Amino acid sequence: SGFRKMAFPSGKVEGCMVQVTCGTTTLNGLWLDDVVYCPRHVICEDMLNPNYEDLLIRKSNHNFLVQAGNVQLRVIGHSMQNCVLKLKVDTANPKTPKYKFVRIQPGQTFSVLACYNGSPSGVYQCAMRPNFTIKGSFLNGSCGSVGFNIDYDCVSFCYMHHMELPTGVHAGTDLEGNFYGPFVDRQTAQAAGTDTTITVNVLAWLYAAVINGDRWFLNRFTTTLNDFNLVAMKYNYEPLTQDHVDILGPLSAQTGIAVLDMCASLKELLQNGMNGRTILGSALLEDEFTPFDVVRQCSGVTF
Amino acid sequence: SGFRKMAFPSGKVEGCMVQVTCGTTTLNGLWLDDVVYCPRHVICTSEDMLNPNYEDLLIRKSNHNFLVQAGNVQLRVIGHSMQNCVLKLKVDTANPKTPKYKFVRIQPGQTFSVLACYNGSPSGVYQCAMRPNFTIKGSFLNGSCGSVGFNIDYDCVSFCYMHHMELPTGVHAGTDLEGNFYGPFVDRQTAQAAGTDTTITVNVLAWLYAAVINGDRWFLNRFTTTLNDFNLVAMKYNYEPLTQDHVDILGPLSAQTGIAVLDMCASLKELLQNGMNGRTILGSALLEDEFTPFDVVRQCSGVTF
Ligand SMILES: O=C(Cc1cccc(Cl)c1)Nc1cncc2ccc(C(=O)O)cc12
Ligand SMILES: O=C(Cc1cccc(Cl)c1)Nc1cncc2ccc(C(=O)O)cc12
Ligand SMILES: [Cl-]
C-alpha cells in the first residue's frame, strides 16, 4: 500500500555527472564514454545575440575545464550538435552505464537528477507538460542537469536542463540538442504557452486510487469518448484519444472499471469538485503519473 | 525557482542493497563493510509471527542457513547476531562500495529518502517524513522489508530507517539501524494500530516560508499571535503543538523573509479557518507538512523573490 511520486534510482546517472567551466560560466556535463555533453550556452552580452558557431570557432580545447570528482579531464576535441556541446575527452568514463538517447512526448514522465558544480544534490520525478515545459526545482548552476528513465538495465536520457522561464517553469533539450517546445537558448522575451492537464495520466492516477482502496468517486455511469472530450476541452484538459483508452486497458481489467466509466467519474469531479474529500492524499487531480508508472509502482519492477 | 518533494541521490545506498534468504522468506539487507543488516523476522514463518520467540528461532540456525546475494555473487555468512529487531550477518567480504556512513535515530517530523527494494534490487526512490504517530506513509509492496531510509547531507550517508511492516491502515512501521522500533510497534502479527495522526506544524510553517521565498504572499495577514493562543487553535485542527524550539529553528527563515514566526503562525491560523478559496500554495491545495525547516533552506534560494 501507499502511492508516492517515485523517481528511478539515480546511481547509474550520478557516475556520469561532471563540472564544465568555460571562462566565468560553470555548469553540469554528462560524461558518457569519451564525450562530455553540456548546454552550448556554456560558451556565453553574448546571450543577447549569440552566433554560437562564431563564438565556438574562437575557443580551443584547453579553454574548457572539465572536472570529474577531484580529477581534471583533458578536453581533446569539441563540436556542436543543435543546442548541445560535445567535448571529446582523453578518458572514457569507467562508470558509463548501458544507455540510449530518447526524445519523449508531452505527458511522459522522467526522473531529474538536479546537480550543482558537477555534484548531484537531489532526485525528483516530473512530467513533460503539454506546453513542453517542466515544473522543476532548479536554482542558478543547475544547467546541464539531466532527465532520464530506466528500462531494465538501460538508462534512457531524455532531457538536459537549459533555462528557467519567467513563470518559474523550466525549458531544455533532448540529448541531441533539440529543444522541447518553441524555446531558444538566449536572453530574449520567451514565455510558456497556456498549459493543459494530462487526461490519460489523471485517469491512471484514479485507477491507482481504486487499487489502493479509494472508491468514493465511482459512479454507475458511463460516457461516450466524444461527450467526454467536449466536457474535458471546457476544463483545459488534453483530448483523450482511442490510443489512451487502449493504454488504460490493463488497469481497466484489473479494477473492473471500464475506461469510459472512469471518464464519467472524472467528468463529475470536474463539474462538482471533491466536496471536501481527497484522493490519495491530494485535493487536486494529479496528472504526473502515466499508466505505466501506475502499473510499475503497483507491481514492484526493479533495476 | 520551483519547489518539489526532492529525495537525495540514491547511488551510495544502491551499492549496499543485497537479498537475504532464510528458508522460504526472501527480503532486503544492507551490506556495509563485512556486515549485512536485515529485519530479524526473516527467520520467521507467517505462523511464527503471532508470538515469535526470536532467541529460540535464532539458536536453531547456523551460518549456512542464511543465503546472501549481492548482484549475481553469493556472499558467505561467517557469523550472526541479533541486536534488538535487527539481524546482523557477518559476511566474508567487505562491501567495496561502502560509503562514509552513520546510524542516526530521527525524531517525528524529520524527513528522509527511501530506496524501495525487492529481491535486493532497488526499484524506486521517494521522500517522506516520520509522522508524529511514528509511522511513515510509504509506498511498499510484499518483499520490500529491509528497504532503508536515509539522508545524505555532505558526503556521509546517515541511515535512519529500515522497513519492517505494513499496518492495517496501509501505513508503515520500522526500526532505526540499531533495531529499535519507532513507535509502540512490535515485529509480531498482533493487533496494533497506528495512533491518531497529526499535522507537523513546524514543517507547514517552513513550507509557508518557502512559498514566500518563491514569491507568494496571498495568505499573509496583518495579525500576530501569542504561542499559547496559536497552540489552542492548532490543536483543534489536529496540528502538533508548536514549541519554543520550533520557533527558534524557524529563526533563519524569519530573518530571510522579514516575517516573524508568530506573524506566520497568525497566517496559518487564518488558513486553517478559511481554507484556500480556490487558490494553491506552491502547486498544492492542501497545507504540506513533509518539508522541514532544514529541507526548505537546502532547496530554496537564499534570495527571496
Ligand atoms: O535560465 C538560466 C540561464 C539562461 C538565460 C538565458 C538563456 C539560457 Cl538558455 C539560459 N539559468 C537558470 C536555470 N534554471 C534555474 C535558474 C534559476 C535562477 C536563475 C538566475 O540566475 O536567477 C537562473 C536559472
Ligand atoms: O508486513 C509485512 C510482513 C510482516 C507481517 C507481520 C509482521 C511483520 Cl514484522 C512483518 N510485509 C509488508 C511490508 N510492507 C508492505 C507490505 C505490503 C503488502 C504486503 C502483503 O503481504 O500483501 C506485505 C507488506
Ligand atoms: Cl531528527
From Swiss-Prot, chain A:
Result after altering residue 88 to R: In strain: Beta/B.1.351
Domain of life where this protein originates: Viruses
UniProt organism field: Severe acute respiratory syndrome coronavirus 2 (2019-nCoV)
Active-site residues (renumbered): 41, 143
Included stretch of the parent chain: 3264 to 3568 of 7096
Peptidase C30 domain: residues covered: 1-303
Name this protein carries in UniProt: 3C-like proteinase nsp5
Activity regulation information from UniProt: Inhibited by pyridone-containing alpha-ketoamides compounds 13a and 13b. In turn, alpha-ketoamide 13b (tert-butyl (1-((S)-1-(((S)-4-(benzylamino)-3,4-dioxo-1-((S)-2-oxopyrrolidin-3-yl)butan-2-yl)amino)-3-cyclopropyl-1-oxopropan-2-yl)-2-oxo-1,2-dihydropyridin-3-yl)carbamate) inhibits SARS-CoV-2 replication in human lung cells. Inhibited ex vivo by michael acceptor inhibitor N3. Inhibited ex vivo by compound 11a and 11b.
Assembly with partners or alone: 3CL-PRO exists as monomer and homodimer. Only the homodimer shows catalytic activity. Interacts with host FBXO22; this interaction promotes the proteasomal degradation of nsp5.
Glycyl lysine isopeptide (Lys-Gly) (interchain with G-Cter in ubiquitin) cross-link site: 5, 88
Stated role: Cleaves the C-terminus of replicase polyprotein at 11 sites. Recognizes substrates containing the core sequence [ILMVF]-Q-|-[SGACN]. Cleaves and inactivates human TRMT1, preventing tRNA guanine(26)-dimethylation of tRNAs. May cleave human NLRP1 in lung epithelial cells, thereby activating the NLRP1 inflammasome pathway. May cleave human GSDMD, triggering alternative GSDME-mediated epithelial cell death upon activation of the NLRP1 inflammasome, which may enhance the release interleukins 1B, 6, 16 and 18. Also able to bind an ADP-ribose-1''-phosphate (ADRP).
Cytoplasmic side: 1-303
